[PDB]
UniProtKB/Swiss-Prot annotation:
Coiled coil: none annotated. One of its GO terms (biological process) is RNA catabolic process. Disulfide bonds join C21-C27, C28-C84, C57-C103, C164-C199, C180-C191. It is found in: Secreted, Extracellular space; Secreted, Cell wall. One of its GO terms (molecular function) is ribonuclease T2 activity. This is Extracellular ribonuclease LE. The active site is at H42, E96, H100. It comes from Solanum lycopersicum (Tomato). It catalyses: a ribonucleotidyl-ribonucleotide-RNA + H2O = a 3'-end 3'-phospho-ribonucleotide-RNA + a 5'-end dephospho-ribonucleoside-RNA + H(+). Pfam families: Ribonuclease_T2 (PF00445). Belongs to the RNase T2 family. PANTHER family: RIBONUCLEASE 1, RIBONUCLEASE T2.
């Protein structure tokens, strides 16, 4: 990012809950119930074109849920936390704003605009539907990494980045999908750079 531009673009990252709840650690359900079996938002992260990113940028603007009271039921459905201990979600959302949303205050000027941007992005990138449409289902099969990639790329027109983790038995599985968004927050772009990590050739899609 040069000049007075704070950062170069965003990753918009969604997570599959079945690969959060099959690992060596316990996941917990939030207090509104087991979530729907769908990708959820992990976060919308400002990032730069050298692989670095801004973080914790404004400690004088702590998260304030009364500013996003109109979004909360959408946030309950589409951005649930599965970390322990069971909670309403506010811990997770507080954490995303403080670490990451505070660094996008140049473009997305207040909390409400930040959270509403991530919910509008989820609503146009339906990953499940896209995958299902290519016959790729969370049914515990292993699928070739190239097919999942090409299915998303054919549907949205930009290449996603797939991050894997490993389940309790050590098997490499579909964890999170990152799509990139321009520095304005207005449109999908090809990522300028991709994060590190390894998936290997064939990966599970766990049931949830």
């Amino acid at each position: 990012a040069s000049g007075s531009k704070d950062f170069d673009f965003f990753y918009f990252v969604q997570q599959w809950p079945g690969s959060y709840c099959d690992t060596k650690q316990s996941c917990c359900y939030p207090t509104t119930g087991k979530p729907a079996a769908d990708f959820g938002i992990h976060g919308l992260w400002p990032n730069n074109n050298d692989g670095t990113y801004p973080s914790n940028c404004d400690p004088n603007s702590p998260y304030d849920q009364s500013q996003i009271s109109d979004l909360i039921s959408s946030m309950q459905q589409n951005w649930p936390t599965l970390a322990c201990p069971s909670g309403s979600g506010s811990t997770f959302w507080s954490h995303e704003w403080e670490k990451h949303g505070t660094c996008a205050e140049s473009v997305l000027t207040n909390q409400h605009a930040y959270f509403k941007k991530a919910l509008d992005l989820k609503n146009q990138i339906d990953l499940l539907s896209i995958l299902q449409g290519a016959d790729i289902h969370p049914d515990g099969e292993s699928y070739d990494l190239v097919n999942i990639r090409n299915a998303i790329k054919s549907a949205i027109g930009y290449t996603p980045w797939i991050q894997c983790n490993v389940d309790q038995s050590g098997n490499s599985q579909l964890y999170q999908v990152y799509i990139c968004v321009d520095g304005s927050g207005s449109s999908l772009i090809e990522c300028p750079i991709f994060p590190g990590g390894k998936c290997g050739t064939s990966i599970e899609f766990p049931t949830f």
